[PDB]
Amino acid sequence: MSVQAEIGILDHVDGSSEFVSQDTKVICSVTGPIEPKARQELPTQLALEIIVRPAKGVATTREKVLEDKLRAVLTPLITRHCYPRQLCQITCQILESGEDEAEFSLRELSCCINAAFLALVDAGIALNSMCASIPIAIIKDTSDIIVDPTAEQLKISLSVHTLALEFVNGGKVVKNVLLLDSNGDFNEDQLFSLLELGEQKCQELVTNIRRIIQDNISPRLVV
Amino acid sequence: MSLSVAEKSYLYDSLASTPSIRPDGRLPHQFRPIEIFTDFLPSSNGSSRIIASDGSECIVSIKSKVVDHHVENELLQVDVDIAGQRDDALVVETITSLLNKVLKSGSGVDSSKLQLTKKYSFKIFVDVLVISSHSHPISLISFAIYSALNSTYLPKLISAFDDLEVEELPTFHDYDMVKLDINPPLVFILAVVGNNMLLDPAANESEVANNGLIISWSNGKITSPIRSVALNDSNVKSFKPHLLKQGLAMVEKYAPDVVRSLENL
Amino acid sequence: RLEIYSPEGLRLDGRRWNELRRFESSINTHPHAADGSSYMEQGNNKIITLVKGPKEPRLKSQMDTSKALLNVSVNITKFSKFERSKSSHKNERRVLEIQTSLVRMFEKNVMLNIYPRTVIDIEIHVLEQDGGIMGSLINGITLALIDAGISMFDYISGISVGLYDTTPLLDTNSLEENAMSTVTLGVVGKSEKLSLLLVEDKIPLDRLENVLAIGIAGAHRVRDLMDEELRKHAQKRVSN
Amino acid sequence: DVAIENNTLSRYADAGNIDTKNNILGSNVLKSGKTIVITSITGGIIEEEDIIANYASVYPVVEVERGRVGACTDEEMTISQKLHDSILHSRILPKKALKVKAGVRSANEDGTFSVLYPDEKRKWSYVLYAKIVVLSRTGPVFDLCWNSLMYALQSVKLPRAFIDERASDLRMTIRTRGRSATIRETYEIICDQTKSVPLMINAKNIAFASNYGIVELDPECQLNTVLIADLDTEAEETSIHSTISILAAPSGNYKQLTLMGGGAKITPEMIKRSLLLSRVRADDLSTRFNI
Amino acid sequence: QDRRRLLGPAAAKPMAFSSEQELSLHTGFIENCNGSALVEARSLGHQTSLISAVYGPRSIRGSFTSQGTISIQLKNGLLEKYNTNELKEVSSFLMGIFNSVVNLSRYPKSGIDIFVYLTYDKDLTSQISSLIPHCITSITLALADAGIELVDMAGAGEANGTVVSFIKNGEEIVGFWKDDGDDEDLLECLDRCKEQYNRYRDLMISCLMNQ
Amino acid sequence: VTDDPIWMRGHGTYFLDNMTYSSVAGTVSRVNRLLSVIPLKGRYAPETGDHVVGRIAEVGNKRWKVDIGGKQHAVLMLGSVNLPGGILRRKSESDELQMRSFLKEGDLLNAEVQSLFQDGSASLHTRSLKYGKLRNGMFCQVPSSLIVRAKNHTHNLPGNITVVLGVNGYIWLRKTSQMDLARDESSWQIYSDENDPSISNNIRQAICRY
Amino acid sequence: AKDIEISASESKFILEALRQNYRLDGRSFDQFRDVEITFGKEFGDVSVKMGNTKVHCRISCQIAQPYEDRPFEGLFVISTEISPMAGSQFENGNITGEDEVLCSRIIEKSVRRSGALDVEGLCIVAGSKCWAVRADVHFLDCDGGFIDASCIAVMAGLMHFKKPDITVHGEQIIVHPVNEREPVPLGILHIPICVTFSFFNPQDTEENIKGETNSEISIIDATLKEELLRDGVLTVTLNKNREVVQVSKAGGLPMDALTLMKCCHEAYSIIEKITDQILQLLKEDSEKRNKYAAMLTSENAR
Amino acid sequence: MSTFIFPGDSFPVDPTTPVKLGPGIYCDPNTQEIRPVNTGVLHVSAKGKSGVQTAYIDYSSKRYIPSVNDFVIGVIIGTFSDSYKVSLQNFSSSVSLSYMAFPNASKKNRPTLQVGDLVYARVCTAEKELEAEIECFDSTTGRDAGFGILEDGMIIDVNLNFARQLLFNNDFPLLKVLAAHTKFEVAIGLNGKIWVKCEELSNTLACYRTIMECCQKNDTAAFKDIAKRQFKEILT
């Protein structure tokens, strides 16, 4: 396989999703809009308090760096002014990484971002645009780009890159780039190659997630 | 604070005048009734329960291990722990410091009553539990450590260890204990309210006092640590050299009697 | 290593198979700054308890209209073992576990209903343990609360049984604890209804009745000392 | 502007003083604006291409002071880990370099002692920390922490390390009150800093950071896309939500770009200008302090 | 490791090992802080630099307090190693001096956060006694720069590991410390430290005079 | 205790049926109309008509919370308080400030029990010019069961000091002032802070001995 | 943390449903929900679902230092840290943590104290090197059933789990990859499975305590609303050998020894059933992992 | 027009043609163009049947946000002097209820209520900036409509989409099915809560079990089979 996504699986929470990308498997919940804690009351804004918890061992400093990365992306995805003075806690539990957690975060991160989008779709919280994120590596053997890499391919990386882009006017016009985190050595001609490919490979992923939400929503909402 | 505004002025007046009368009504040289109870753990080297008149209670317990002392520069470890405070509030750890420095080796306390041959020292683990506090503990802890350390029994060496006896670990006699003699300091607390210097504040006195001076008595004389302390935040003032010299003079006179009454129960 | 029992009915303490340990207690050990207090000896388990309060807390969140808030703090010092405790224990699961057990249990024994907008703090300081300590802590609480004038339904009395296959040995020490499976039990009042049964070890289910039945007798035996101790004290302070 | 003073804090600041209360391996003070970053790099000892797992990492604590009584805050922890992460992916320190060997320290009965050198049983590697504290943070601090780290790292020397004859049969008798395994062998290895050989490091993989912002100007909202280089005030930290962080190395190699497009328009035209600014800043710092 | 911070490999262990002074003052040199001071002391013995920063008056509302309070953090140097407890003692010492010197009544619901950074201490040749003049010099400057009320400038000498702090031109004592000095030093030290206080008094006044 | 269904219905019992098994420690004795378990010792219990000496724990926007040494705090509120500057004056609106100026936390004051409520809580009142703040003295304290229980126990003693002695165990001992001197007052000094400079040597010593 | 506010009518209704001898789920008081065990694509990943209650366990091992008291055993540490995917009354690791401790402690009492995982054999080098086995239990959905589900998640997780084949020479441990040589499964001494009896009072405490009647409603396997609303609990844990592994009873409704033991006896049938279910599910997933391993057998007949 | 919409898409009518806004259409607060923000089915009305078209998206939620003229079941989770404080659906923002929110109640005609009574009410004020208010007295109708205080019964949590779909279409056959199998009393909240009560314990419970079951599966043919099997089960 490639990717699979389901929504609605969890029943006690306002919205939820299960994102699986090959070996990598992230299950997500959005809870809220709910009653703010006083330290997480913000005046005009919805608050975000994101938690990433790894499968193996217990969450550390790493997951805060991930939280920041997630929080960056999610702040213009969720309509902040939609709820003033309410909190939303997004709790992302990793059921399998299937890689090495300290070393590579490429698949882990991309998966969380997508499960967060879906969960928020199920939740009903306003979403301006479609977001997905794809993982891109470069392997040293050919000294070239391999899109959507497996666990083996990640080991033999010299460098690794995630991109996330905001999708409007048919979910197919790139509005903006909400992330481009390019770690390891790159020079510019690769990097604009990673955008280019990146564009088209994202838009496929957007098609697939788009399709999934319609099919799963449609027997629920009927007329 | 926990007292009245009216109460604090009455006290300030009372105490600050020539007689210096106070709720006990002591002259400045007198001490409240304390009760020493000892040796209640058969499991420990020595133990101490001291109940004071304000209803403050410290329990002080002496445990040990013999250790090679050439990999150590500490012989006495104080752990202080105050019921109803955690293990890292400012006052608790500051008390731990004071006490560790009072009991520091070669400084007002022996580092040769704790060694049984010149390679092996006993590391005495002082472990202090304050059962109730609502007044300062350090004086009462000092007094409790005295009675303790003169109730401290250690294992008696099997045989006179040399440092070349066979070059293996020292090994104790099965039943026979050695009495530990060792004279620890005694911390005494003096209080200044006006130009009047008074030995041993009660709780009430501590809450109106400008400052106090902690000083210690070791070995027939006064010695370091010396430290001033401010025994409130909100009735605080400054003081003069002459009043500090009169507090020296006062302890020198009134300390010896106390050590000798406390020593033999 | 070592005998735990013999057909001749001895131990290495020298107790009998339904004999209790040394039970010594005395009440009011802090009668100048604690509302009730008691000292509990069972063996060498040396437990002091203080009850402080009933008092209102000065935090609104700890105020409760429907009943008092109850706090039980189990403090275990660094000289309860034979050696110096290297570890922090006042921030350990084992101790929070005892806390969560004593509080939920005494919360129903004590009437907190008749003390609304109150907080009670039970403060339990261990001075030594030599095992049989989990039943000994219950007993010290029970004498503290009755001294403090805090109403109750019954006395919970803790007692331990170690099963040496089919041979149940009432009361325990360090050897007994570390060399077989121990049961710990509590009964409330002179009832057969058990408040607390705690098992950490494989006890067979087929023999489950044999260890509890002797323990519910064994419990009654502890409870009459508690009454005797208390009425000898109450008679003293009503003569004067 | 960036001003550094180096070896004003390190153990090895002098040649005629080696004092035992000091152990600071490499050190830098760096002042930019008012925001001052103090870096100390410190070792430890742990007995044990192009593949990421042959490069090692510093395990920093970055502490920031903004008037917070604590020092365990969510802002500083995220810095420290991200900082471990940057050092891994920039590939500076190959694990062969911390992989040291030990000679012999043999005491003689001739009243002298000989500590015998190899050419610098069991094996050892070192670990590297950095204790970085920050006083009066006024903007994004990340790049300051990274700039100082490098000048320090290129000042790191490592102690020498030695072992006794029959190290593999030296006893441990430290554990007691078991229950078996309370007498065993162990290896014991002191470090001696009477000689320190200097850090073997990959120069090409040294980067120096910068920071960027992307922001829009509207004339009716103080009643297109504009590029800022670097952020210094509260106002810039607060509201420049689209930002690019680049670590650029001064041969046209880049070891991280991280774009956070917090809401505003980014055309890649801005991105294309920033990658050149960052290398030219990298080239400026390089030549400025000859390190 | 830990959940709040990265601590790397945990079975890893440290490395085993193998007026006579000039105080020159500085202030107002870094910003995000209500006032800051810098004290560097050079002596034959040891050279040292101490940074201080004082944050607030801050409001601490949701409770009414009789008067303000002062809170002292000492932070372990990056080239000096001390026990946490000693830092607590010295924090406690300095608080009780400052309690007496800072006037606290113009400011209800106040907490003041004082940070003492004991950054560099280096010997070319206890220890904690010696840096007490320098801590007291630093912090006073900082309270003055911020606009926090003070009775007199606080300042001290160190004669023979004995530290005496005075205010009012040597007339009043606001604290006394003796730790591992010799018995009966009293006259030598008080005379010697008065000299020191009067000497650093004016230095602080002249730092405050460039602004 | 008993299986009788007419007795043991009151305090310090519980029951299943009529069988009442105690609930507290104490004696059985007839208080009121019912043979009932009566505590051996315990926390101070308020009642109507008691006159108690006690201190402020909290100041609110509508009431002071008073520490009498009971199971919870007793309430003292604005329709129930004489005030210095008149008899009720110097205060035109409710504010937590205006309350606070007269009475600070920890201040000590003699106040009478207006109605005992079934909460535990006791509505108190100060309303005479003898009632209100206790000043010029020294604090003393005992158990509340080793003083006589009476409606009043506040009186002059020799050496011309006055004891002010509640039902709750708190004791203030002060020099005979106008309000206690008028039996053998004040109206601007009811809750205003003032320690007389005219307390002398022999006055203080009398209070330490007493 | 923020808790669920139910009505008085809810409280009345659920009691009356028990009194008149039904349940909300249409269950019996003695009926346990079907647990389905979904084994991963990796060793020691187990998804454990019981109806809506969804829990996971992932097992990890690492090389670790023994402890000072007993260096002849290894380490079992149970994280039953909980994040809000079931409510908001569990948040941010520990924030109250009463339930964390109890579930963690009982699972330790089951697997380490009694034995249900070998610990002696966790020493690679005694007093130097050992395995540390970490069970991290993460609930994703909860509908009561908390202890029961967590336990099954710990033991299925451990049984499916496997660890690097190791060779020692001296103190140097050559760690061997899990494609290089086949990883070794853990030692299992017993199968603890819990059954949590949630006790509801039809009277009030005072009538209960010196009464002797049994008319107490005994139910297992509570719902979310039931978990909150229970007056008392008995958590009893048995293995499939007629021995009680651990008992946690400490607060709630008191009970006669006969009634407690009744409980134990009921649970004893129910745990063989869960144990059986677990056995045959493990097998059929194992058959798919064994499908060419059967071909490449080196244990063959002469 | 009745077509599936996603967020991040164009509006499928022109913004030039006047429209009234309903749920799930947002207007950019800079751009001043309207766009969808929810994933569902979009409906637009046609003029000549309305005065001006009203547009809206039907989207599933499981979390309730206050809107006016909505009918809601709450539990009273606090007693305060002048008002009571309601939680409609758990973990969320305060909803306030005047003392005088009930028919025939004034300040000389104050109620006495308690925590843990169930109420049924209209949202009569809703803001996000301020608190939402419910009155149990219908000011528009002028007769409360059997609004008031429920007692007994059992609250079934539901889906939001299910709850609106049962309320706003009376061709939905769940309650037609149920009415054959018992006689019952029903109260439908729009906060994702629906109350039911029969006279007897058996009868209430069967309703509770059935609506719940039906709600999960959420399929039209499922609904018939589920009732018939469940209402037999409770009498077997």
Distance CA(H128)–CA(A86), nearest Å, equals 9
The residue of G201, G204, G207 whose CB has the most chain F CBs within 10 angstroms, and thus the best one to mutate to test that interface, is: G207
Establish if G21 touches chain H: CB-CB under 8 angstroms: no
List the structure tokens of F64: 């002071």
Which one, of E51, E103, E99, lies nearest residue E75 by Cα?
Answer: E51
Strand partners, B82: B130
Q: Compare CB distances from F25 to C111, C117, C234 and report the shortest one's residue.
A: C234
Strand partners, D247: D209, D256
List the structure tokens of C173: 């020490």
CATH classification of the domain holding D168: 3.30.230.70
Which one, of A169, A181, A78, lies nearest residue A134 by Cα?
Answer: A181
Q: Give the 3-state DSSP-derived string for E24-73, with helices as H, strands as E and coil as C.
A: EEEECCCCCCCEEEEEEEECCCEEEEEEEEEEEEECCCCCCCCCCEEEEE
Distance CA(C87)–CA(C74), nearest Å, equals 16
CB–CB of G9 and H234 under 8 A? Answer: no
Strand partners, B121: B67, B115
Q: Give the 3-state DSSP-derived string for chain G, with helices as H, strands as E and coil as C.
A: CCCCCCCHHHHHHHHHHHHCCCCCCCCCCCCCCCEEEEECCCCCEEEEEECCEEEEEEEEEEEECCCCCCCCCCEEEEECCCCCCCCCCCCCCCCCCHHHHHHHHHHHHHHHHCCCCCCHHHEEECCCEEEEEEEEEEEEECCCCHHHHHHHHHHHHHHHCEECCEEEECCEEEECCCCCCCCEECCCCCCCEEEEEEEECCCCHHHHHCCCCCCCEEEECCCHHHHHHCCEEEEEEEECCCEEEEEEEEEEEEEEHHHHHHHHHHHHHHHHHHHHHHHHHHHHHHHHHCCCCCCCCCCCCC
Neighbour order of strands in the sheet with H154-157: H154-157, H193-197, H185-188
Q: How far is B256 from chain C (nearest CA, A)?
A: 30
Distance CA(H54)–CA(H44), nearest Å, equals 6
Q: Give the 3-state DSSP-derived string for chain D, with helices as H, strands as E and coil as C.
A: CEEEEECCCCHHHCCCCCCCCCCCCEEEEEEECCEEEEEEEEEEEECCCCCHHHECCECCEECCECCCCCCCCHHHHHHHHHHHHHHHHHCCCEHHHCCCCCEEEEECCCCCEEEECCCCCCCCEEEEEEEEEEECCCCCCHHHHHHHHHHHHCCCEEEEEEECCCCCCEEECCCCCCCCCCCEEECCCCEEEEEEEECCCCHHHCCEEEEEEEEECCCCCCCCEEEEECCCCHHHHHHCCEEEEEEEECCCEEEEEEEEECCCCCCHHHHHHHHHHHHHHHHHHHHHCCC
List the structure tokens of D233: 């005030």
Residue of G nearest to F15 (CA): G206
Contact by Cβ (8 Å): E22, E44:
no
Distance CA(C134)–CA(E11), nearest Å, equals 34
CB–CB of G70 and D178 under 8 A? Answer: yes
Q: Please, which residues 243-282 of chain G have a Cβ atom closer than 8 Å to chain C?
A: 243-252, 254-257, 260-261, 264-265, 268
Contacts of A58 in chain E (CB under 8 A): 3
Contact by Cβ (8 Å): B85, B35:
no
Q: How far is A65 from chain E (nearest CA, A)?
A: 12
Chain G touches chain H, with at least 3 Cβ pairs below 8 Å, answer yes
Residue C113 DSSP symbol: T
Q: Which chains touch F (3 or more CB pairs under 8 A)?
A: B, C, E, G
Establish if F15 touches chain G: CB-CB under 8 angstroms: yes
The four Cα atoms G249, G255, G261, G267 give a dihedral, to 10 degrees, of -60
Distance CA(C74)–CA(C98), nearest Å, equals 8
Amino acid symbol at A46: L
Contact by Cβ (8 Å): A65, A11:
no
Please list the alpha-helical segments (H only) found in chain B: 5-16, 90-102, 138-149, 203-206, 241-263
Distance CA(A142)–CA(C126), nearest Å, equals 68
Coil, helix or strand for C228?
helix
CB–CB of D122 and G128 under 8 A? Answer: no
For D247, list phi and psi in degrees, rounded to 5.
-105, 115
Strand partners, G136: G58, G79
Establish if H90 touches chain G: CB-CB under 8 angstroms: yes
For A47, list phi and psi in degrees, rounded to 5.
-100, 150
Q: In Å, how far are G9, H136, H179, H199 from H147, measured between CA atoms? A: 18, 5, 22, 20
Cβ-in-10-Å burial (0-12, 13-18, 19+) of D230 comes to middle
Residue C61 DSSP symbol: G
The residue of D7, D17, D21 whose CB has the most chain E CBs within 10 angstroms, and thus the best one to mutate to test that interface, is: D21
Q: How far is E210 from chain B (nearest CA, A)?
A: 30
Place of tokens 């200044």: B192
Establish if D80 touches chain A: CB-CB under 8 angstroms: yes
Establish if B9 touches chain F: CB-CB under 8 angstroms: yes
Packing angle of the helix pair B241-263, B138-149 (nearest 10 deg): 40
Residue B53 DSSP symbol: T
Kindly provide the b/e burial profile for residues H31-56, where b requires at least 16 CB atoms within 10 angstroms of the residue's own CB. Answer: eeebbbbbbbbbbbbeeeeeeebebb
Q: In Å, how far are G206, G267, H26 from C199, measured between CA atoms? A: 27, 16, 61
Contacts of A174 in chain D (CB under 8 A): none
List the structure tokens of A108: 């882990």
Coil, helix or strand for F118?
coil
Q: Compare CB distances from E31 to D81, D131, D136 and report the shortest one's residue.
A: D136
Provide the CA H88 distance to its chain's centre, in angstroms: 10
List the structure tokens of D261: 């497009």
Pairing of strands B76-82, B120-132: parallel
Which one, of A164, A136, A104, A186, lies nearest residue D247 by Cα?
Answer: A186
Contacts of A173 in chain H (CB under 8 A): none
Amino acid symbol at H171: D
CB–CB of E67 and B234 under 8 A? Answer: yes
Where do breaks (C to N over 2.5 Å) occur in chain G, by preceding residue number? Answer: none
Residue F178 DSSP symbol: G
Place of tokens 């995982």: G117
Contacts of A212 in chain H (CB under 8 A): none
CB–CB of F138 and B14 under 8 A? Answer: yes
CB–CB of E4 and A59 under 8 A? Answer: no
Class of domain G6-302: alpha beta
Q: Compare CB distances from D181 to G127, G171, G172 and report the shortest one's residue.
A: G127
With residue B76 as reference, give the H or E element that holds it.
Answer: strand B76-82
Distance CA(H92)–CA(H74), nearest Å, equals 12
Establish if G53 touches chain C: CB-CB under 8 angstroms: no
With residue E114 as reference, give the H or E element that holds it.
Answer: strand E111-123
Q: How far is G10 from chain H (nearest CA, A)?
A: 6
Provide the CA G288 distance to its chain's centre, in angstroms: 26
CB–CB of B238 and E92 under 8 A? Answer: no
Distance CA(G21)–CA(C233), nearest Å, equals 51
Amino acid symbol at H81: S
CB–CB of H154 and G13 under 8 A? Answer: yes
Please list the alpha-helical segments (H only) found in A86-127: 106-123
- The Cα diameter of chain H in Å comes to 64
Contact by Cβ (8 Å): B152, B44:
no
Contact residues for C35 (Cβ-Cβ < 8 A; gap 6+): C51, C52, C53, C54, C148, C149, F43
Distance CA(B258)–CA(B185), nearest Å, equals 12
Cβ-based contacts under 8 A for chains G and H: 49
Q: Which stretches does DSSP call E strand in chain F?
A: 15-16, 19-20, 26-31, 34-39, 51-59, 63-67, 74-77, 108-116, 122-125, 132-133, 137-141, 155-157, 161-165, 170-175
CB–CB of A65 and D81 under 8 A? Answer: yes
Contact by Cβ (8 Å): C112, C152:
no
Domain range enclosing D4: 1-290
CB atoms inside a 10 Å sphere around CB G136: 22
Q: Compare CB distances from E174 to B97, B226, B238 and report the shortest one's residue.
A: B238
With residue C213 as reference, give the H or E element that holds it.
Answer: helix C208-236
Please list the alpha-helical segments (H only) found in chain H: 160-167, 174-181, 201-217, 222-233
Chain G touches chain F, with at least 3 Cβ pairs below 8 Å, answer yes
With residue B238 as reference, give the H or E element that holds it.
Answer: none
Distance CA(E191)–CA(E164), nearest Å, equals 10
Which one, of H39, H16, H38, H9, lies nearest residue H25 by Cα?
Answer: H38
Amino acid symbol at D198: P
List the structure tokens of E33: 């802080």
Q: Which chains touch C (3 or more CB pairs under 8 A)?
A: B, F, G
How many structural domains are present in chain D? 1
Distance CA(E181)–CA(E184), nearest Å, equals 9
Establish if D72 touches chain E: CB-CB under 8 angstroms: yes
Place of tokens 């002696």: G120
Which one, of A20, C192, H156, lies nearest residue G209 by Cα?
Answer: C192
Rg (CA), chain C: 18
Which one, of A69, H65, G106, A99, lies nearest residue C93 by Cα?
Answer: G106
Q: In Å, how far are H96, H144, H145, H167 from H140, measured between CA atoms? A: 20, 9, 11, 19
Which one, of G193, G214, G188, lies nearest residue G267 by Cα?
Answer: G193
CB–CB of F209 and B25 under 8 A? Answer: yes
Which one, of C124, C128, C132, C126, lies nearest residue C21 by Cα?
Answer: C132
The four Cα atoms A128, A130, A131, A132 give a dihedral, to 10 degrees, of 170
Distance CA(H5)–CA(H36), nearest Å, equals 8
Which one, of D162, D263, D273, D157, lies nearest residue D212 by Cα?
Answer: D273
Kindly provide the b/e burial profile for residues E106-136, where b requires at least 16 CB atoms within 10 angstroms of the residue's own CB. Answer: ebeebbbbbbbbbbbbbeeeeebbbbbbbbb
List the structure tokens of H70: 């909505």
Which one, of C91, C100, C47, C92, lies nearest residue C71 by Cα?
Answer: C100
List the structure tokens of C114: 């008749």
